[PDB]
Ligand SMILES: Cc1cc2nc3c(=O)[nH]c(=O)nc-3n(C[C@H](O)[C@H](O)[C@H](O)COP(=O)(O)O)c2cc1C
């Protein structure tokens with residue numbers, strides 16, 4: 001809490017004053033991968049443990065995809081106190097992504113806009129990187145610290161479904177869960193994969209590839225969706241997810257909308273907006289998807305989480321787990337312990353025995 005204030009009031013503002021967002025991100029990835037991190041002294045209580053997706057998670061707060069795109073900082077991220085880590089998005093072939101600058105801070109809105117465009121080291125490099133620590137991950141997982149791998153598609157690929165299938169085959173055996181990302185705002189055509197007939201075709205192929213993996217190397221498969229879907233889109237996704245037995249949903253990616261009230265000078269930059277202005281749009285999408293799937297499909301809630309309250313609202317709305325990313329760029333590593341500490345306090349105040357009891361509680365009021 002002393003370092004929470006120091007990081008929040010002094011350290012982070014100073015690094016932000018010195019470095020553009022992409023440079024700061026690269027540096028943060030480097031520091032994290034080296035273990036150069038403050039004391040994550042928070043000890044996870046049993047209340048925070050969640051069992052879902054065929055796994056135990058010792059706390060429900062994860063790092064969202066996009067921070068460790070290439071699988072370089074996984075262990076440093078667990079050391080930061082995250083109960084699970086998602087790397088990616090990873091595309092089959094290496095690709096540079098969009099021209100710089102492609103990441104923008106909106107300090108007045110506690111928001112970020114990015115158009116990275118799936119910069120990726122590619123499947124082969126990430127595979128070897130994960131292979132080098134595969135058995136350490138197997139122990140982490142057994143210990144309640146699972147690993148997710150988020151799959152993207154190359155900019156120039158003609159068959160999107162084959163890009164994902166390739167990802168399932170190459171990184172599936174190294175992952176506790178896979179994410180089919182059909183919601184990036186920064187790849188042309190990508191989000192139209194969210195439509196019904198095309199999503200059914202895509203996910204059928206994905207699940208078939210997954211089912212062809214040997215039993216101990218067979219990950220759960222989740223779909224990550226946008227916060228900008230029509231009601232029709234959401235109904236169709238819920239329907240396809242139930243028809244195919246998709247294991248879970250990640251809700252949500254960044255928004256292409258610009259909510260009224262944004263103050264940041266850079267608010268009109270092209271890209272996906274994350275952070276505080278996304279928070280409630282995201283929570284509302286979780287609420288809708290939970291109801292449409294009858295509370296039977298696990299949801300990882302993400303978008304604008306920076307406190308225990310933010311996390312609990314998404315849990316009560318139907319999320320079994322939450323992720324954050326943008327909060328980390330403003331508050332630094334201490335925000336992880338902060339969210340966990342506040343979440344636990346709020347669960348007790350509201351009469352929940354643990355996180356599990358709170359999941360979807362709003363729908364039973
Ligand atoms: C700079 C940046 C890069 C991101 N890259 C990815 C990505 O590659 N794949 C993905 O599924 N989501 C990506 N995201 C989205 C996050 O995973 C998350 O869905 C979104 O930022 C909302 O969470 P937040 O408000 O806590 O940041 C990225 C977000 C940011 C800010």
Ligand SMILES: O=C(O)c1ccccc1/C=N/Nc1nc(-c2ccccc2Cl)cs1
Nearest residue numbers: 021024025028031032037105328329332333
């Ligand atoms: O600066 C931005 O606007 C930005 C934008 C997008 C993605 C990452 C960042 C930067 N994030 N900076 C981070 N710093 C840390 C950090 C800060 C202090 C000590 C150790 C670490 Cl790992 C974690 S994330």
Ligand SMILES: O=C(O)c1cc(=O)[nH]c(=O)[nH]1
Nearest residue numbers: 115116117118184254272
């Ligand atoms: O690589 C990107 O730019 C990116 C991917 C994604 O899924 N979400 C996002 O906000 N940006």
